[PDB]
Amino acid sequence: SAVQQKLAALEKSSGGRLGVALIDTADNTQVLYRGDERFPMCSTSKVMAAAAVLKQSETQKQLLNQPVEIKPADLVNYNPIAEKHVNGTMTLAELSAAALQYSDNTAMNKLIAQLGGPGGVTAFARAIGDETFRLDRTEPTLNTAIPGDPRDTTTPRAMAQTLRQLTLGHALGETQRAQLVTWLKGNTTGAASIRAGLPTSWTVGDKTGSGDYGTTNDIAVIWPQGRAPLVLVTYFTQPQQNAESRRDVLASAARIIAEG
Numbered sequence: 001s002a003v004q005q006k007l008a009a010l011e012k013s014s015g016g017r018l019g020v021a022l023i024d025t026a027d028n029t030q031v032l033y034r035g036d037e038r039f040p041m042c043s044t045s046k047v048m049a050a051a052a053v054l055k056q057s058e059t060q061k062q063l064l065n066q067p068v069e070i071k072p073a074d075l076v077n078y079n080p081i082a083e084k085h086v087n088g089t090m091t092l093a094e095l096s097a098a099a100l101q102y103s104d105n106t107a108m109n110k111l112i113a114q115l116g117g118p119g120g121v122t123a124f125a126r127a128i129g130d131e132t133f134r135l136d137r138t139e140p141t142l143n144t145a146i147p148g149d150p151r152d153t154t155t156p157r158a159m160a161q162t163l164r165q166l167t168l169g170h171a172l173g174e175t176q177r178a179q180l181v182t183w184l185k186g187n188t189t190g191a192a193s194i195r196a197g198l199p200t201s202w203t204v205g206d207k208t209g210s211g212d213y214g215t216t217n218d219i220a221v222i223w224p225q226g227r228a229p230l231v232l233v234t235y236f237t238q239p240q241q242n243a244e245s246r247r248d249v250l251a252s253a254a255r256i257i258a259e260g
């Protein structure tokens with residue numbers, strides 16, 4: 001279609017590989033670009049880990065208040081919030097918010113441990129019908145984003161469907177579905193990605209990711225005005241391992257998708 005033609009031209013001008021999945025929750029239509037190809041998730045995978053802990057909290061009703069120790073051996077490559085609480089503790093709610101709103105990797109590793117390793121995160125995806133998501137490693141080696149490597153990858157089509165079930169659907173419980181929505185709405189890392197390509201009036205919750213090979217990702221649930229919400233996944237990766245981030249590609253892909 002016409003939007004397919006604009007995303008392809010955007011991909012060609014970028015010199016990279018672009019994967020886009022849009023779900024319009026009015027007629028359940030889908031616009032896809034390389035929607036069945038695998039992309040390195042990087043820290044967009046933190047939504048699955050946080051949602052998995054939220055699913056646990058449905059049965060363990062005070063799980064999110066459990067304190068977790070932050071130790072110097074726990075710090076990894078990017079620890080904005082966890083660095084402020086070394087030799088102290090953070091609750092699982094605080095670690096989830098830090099993981100999704102500041103992309104703290106030490107917090108991610110705490111969520112993975114709560115679920116019993118990366119295989120516990122993958123388990124949750126399978127439990128909600130995501131047959132594609134796979135988490136094989138912890139922070140930070142899950143961000144190697146090597147071409148052809150299926151580790152820690154997913155397809156745009158599967159993440160869009162999963163992100164819909166987690167936020168708009170009821171893959172989670174009522175209080176949990178609302179908590180994840182509030183967390184995504186208060187992200188601080190995404191002003192230059194999907195948000196930058198959408199109208200100011202649109203309310204958006206998102207989770208960004210980045211890694212080697214210039215990988216630049218963002219997944220977002222979008223609430224327009226008087227309109228049925230949309231779900232958009234934008235994944236991008238490049239041929240050079242040392243390639244720089246291209247958040248502008250994500251902004252332009254969201255601009256094209258949102259009629260423009």
Ligand SMILES: *C(=O)N1C[C@H](NOS(=O)(=O)O)CC[C@H]1C(N)=O
Nearest residue numbers: 042043078103143189208209210
């Ligand atoms: C996620 O991909 N990452 C965590 C952190 N912030 O990136 S994000 O705001 O696009 O999610 C640093 C880069 C990256 C990583 N190396 O883990």
